[PDB]
């Protein structure tokens, strides 16, 4: 019994926790953005979306989402937001949208 | 070849000098009690020696066996038609220095109309082969110092053969005293 | 392992002289001449008509004995011959001859094939520089055998040389009788060897 | 990563090495990409070691990071030498 690979496990635990923090928060932010989009608040909503995007990017940069997954997520969010905005709003801050 | 030596204290020993009790691992067969351990230059020589010993012993044993069913006309008839029925039993002990003792004890315990018989007596754990043998012969499996393996025990239970496990020689002896019966 | 044991008995069994001793197997002594029949009791008996298989088998045995080889080895050689293209019999024979011992015997280095083999084994025989001690050594054409450096001054060899002094060698062979040398030139064809064996029969036997 | 390395084949006491291009995480006998050369330690043949040079160079260019022994062998052959 007993090997110095418990260290790795410990490391992973910490990393897992950090990952969870990154990811859950991101998810929450996304949800909030979606909610904002729902009625047509636009500017604040846009800001929130931007923040979420930033968070996602940060996660990608670190050892969380990584790669193109983050990008995909962003696309999903942004497109959804745009769709929601079609029900009243139009880009008020400029923000995440390409206008 | 010597694999492991371990004293009574519970410690691993690489070197053991004259006069210390070591748990020597590395014998291909389980040697008899009070057997003189000897040193050999190589393995082949040792093997040869063993072979020679076997030749000495086995041939003699065979010879001894052969002078028993001498007459087959009348003597054989007398010996095939058996009046006093015999009980078969197969023993498995923990050490060589207890099995023999048990045998000695039970050889006296045979004055009754039912005469006990040892067919297979070895030291160690019971197995499914043993169970099979019992089934063939109508024999009892008795254990001193050795607990039955789980699978083996299960087999013994379901097939319908006598399985026994003990803590003391006395207990075993007592158990044996119940096996001769009386019918009336 | 060799055959080992009684030799001219084998010759007797076949009924044709096999030259398995050299001398005596040349003189009135090979038992071919004094007695010509098979060994043991029913050798002098009425000889029954042999089966098709049997004749072939006998021939094969004759061949093997003549070349003095283990059966497994012989089989292997045959297989090799079969694998190679040409005339599976003649080629096979050639291959067999290429066995170092046989070559030595031919070059008159030793008067008997077994003797030759023995000589080869006991480091007395050198193939282009190195003393070679295994008679299963197969020699590819245009190659030099010699009586070894330290075996040139032994009596038996001298005797052999004397015996072969005057009497000529096979067309696939050349020997320097002065310096105990011997070049294996051509690979020996069947036509060169007036052997009593018929290879065809052997081949047939092998087939199935 | 991709490595130029030596693959043992042959017999006991008669080793033979294939100067070969393969992935790092492989059997030292395993499925290699390309046989670029061969090397006999025992120096038994006249043409005892030989490697095709151009292919090796190409591999290097791509990024085949050789083993030390392999590198040495290559140098001996005349791959790393430039003019």
């Amino acid at each position: 019994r007993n090997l110095s690979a418990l260290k790795r496990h410990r490391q992973s635990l910490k990393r897992r926790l950090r990952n969870k923090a990154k990811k859950s928060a991101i998810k929450t932010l996304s949800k909030k953005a979606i909610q904002l989009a729902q009625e047509g608040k636009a500017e604040e909503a846009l800001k929130i979306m931007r923040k979420a995007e930033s968070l996602i990017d940060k996660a990608a940069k670190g050892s969380t989402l990584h790669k193109n997954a983050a990008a995909r997520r962003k696309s999903r969010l942004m497109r959804k937001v745009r769709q929601l905005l079609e029900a009243a709003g139009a880009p008020l801050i400029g923000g995440g949208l390409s206008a | 070849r010597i694999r492991a030596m371990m004293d009574a204290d519970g410690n691993q020993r690489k070197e053991a000098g004259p006069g210390s009790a070591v748990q020597v691992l590395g014998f291909q067969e389980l040697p008899h009690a009070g057997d003189v351990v000897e040193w050999v230059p190589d393995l082949e020589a040792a093997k040869e020696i063993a072979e020679e010993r076997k030749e000495e012993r086995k041939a003699r044993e065979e010879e001894e066996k052969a002078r028993r069913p001498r007459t087959m006309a009348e003597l054989l008839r007398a010996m095939q038609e058996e009046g006093r029925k015999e009980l078969n039993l197969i023993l498995r002990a923990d050490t060589q220095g207890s099995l023999e003792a048990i045998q000695h004890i039970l050889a006296r315990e045979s004055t009754e109309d039912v005469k006990i018989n040892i067919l297979l007596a070895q030291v160690g754990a019971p197995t499914e082969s043993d169970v099979l043998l019992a089934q063939t012969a109508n024999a009892a499996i008795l254990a001193f110092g050795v607990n039955p393996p789980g699978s083996v025990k299960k087999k013994a239970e379901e097939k319908g053969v006598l399985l026994k496990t003990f803590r003391i020689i006395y207990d075993l002896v007592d158990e044996v005293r119940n096996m001769v019966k009386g019918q009336r | 392992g060799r055959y080992i044991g009684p030799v001219c008995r084998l010759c007797r069994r076949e009924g044709v002289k096999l030259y398995l001793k050299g001398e005596r197997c040349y003189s009135p002594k090979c038992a071919m001449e004094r007695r010509p029949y098979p060994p043991g009791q029913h050798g002098q008996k009425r000889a029954r008509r042999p089966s098709d298989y049997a004749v072939r088998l006998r021939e094969k045995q004759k061949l093997r004995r003549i070349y003095g080889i283990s059966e497994r080895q012989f089989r292997n050689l045959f297989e090799e011959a079969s694998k190679k293209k040409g005339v599976t019999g003649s080629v096979f024979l050639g291959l067999l001859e290429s066995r170092l011992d046989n070559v030595v015997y031919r070059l008159g280095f030793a008067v008997s094939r077994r003797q030759a083999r023995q000589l080869v084994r006991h480091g007395h025989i050198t193939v282009n520089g190195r003393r070679v001690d295994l008679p299963s050594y197969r020699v590819r054409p245009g190659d030099e055998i010699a009586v070894a450096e330290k075996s040139r001054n032994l009596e038996l060899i001298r005797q052999n040389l004397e015996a072969m002094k005057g009497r000529k060698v096979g067309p696939w062979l050349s020997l320097d009788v002065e310096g105990m040398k011997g070049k294996f030139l051509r690979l020996p064809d069947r036509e060169d060897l007036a052997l009593p064996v018929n290879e065809q029969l052997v081949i047939e036997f092998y087939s199935r | 990563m991709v490595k130029i390395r030596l693959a043992r084949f042959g017999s006991k006491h008669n080793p033979h090495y294939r100067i070969v291009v393969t992935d790092a995480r492989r059997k030292r006998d395993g499925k290699y990409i390309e046989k670029i050369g061969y090397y006999d330690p025992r120096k038994t043949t006249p043409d005892w070691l030989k490697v095709d040079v151009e292919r090796a160079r190409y591999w290097l260019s791509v990024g085949a990071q050789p083993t030390d022994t392999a590198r040495r062998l290559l140098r001996q052959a005349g791959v790393f030498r430039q003019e």
Partner: protein, 59 residues
């Protein structure tokens, strides 16, 4: 059981050959003599290998 007289008991340890017998019904197995509890056939001198008896000591 091949061999000129068996040695076999009633709870004898045996090793089975297999290979039929044209005479006997239900029987498809030889018992291989020279192992476990089937000892070699005494006074065989020719075909010993099949019956598991050791080389005789010559004089």
């Amino acid at each position: 059981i091949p061999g000129e007289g068996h040695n076999l008991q009633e709870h004898s340890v045996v090793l089975i050959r297999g290979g039929r017998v044209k005479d006997l019904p239900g029987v498809r197995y030889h018992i291989v003599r020279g192992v476990y509890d089937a000892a070699g056939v005494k006074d065989r001198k020719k075909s010993r290998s099949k019956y598991g008896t050791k080389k005789p000591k010559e004089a």
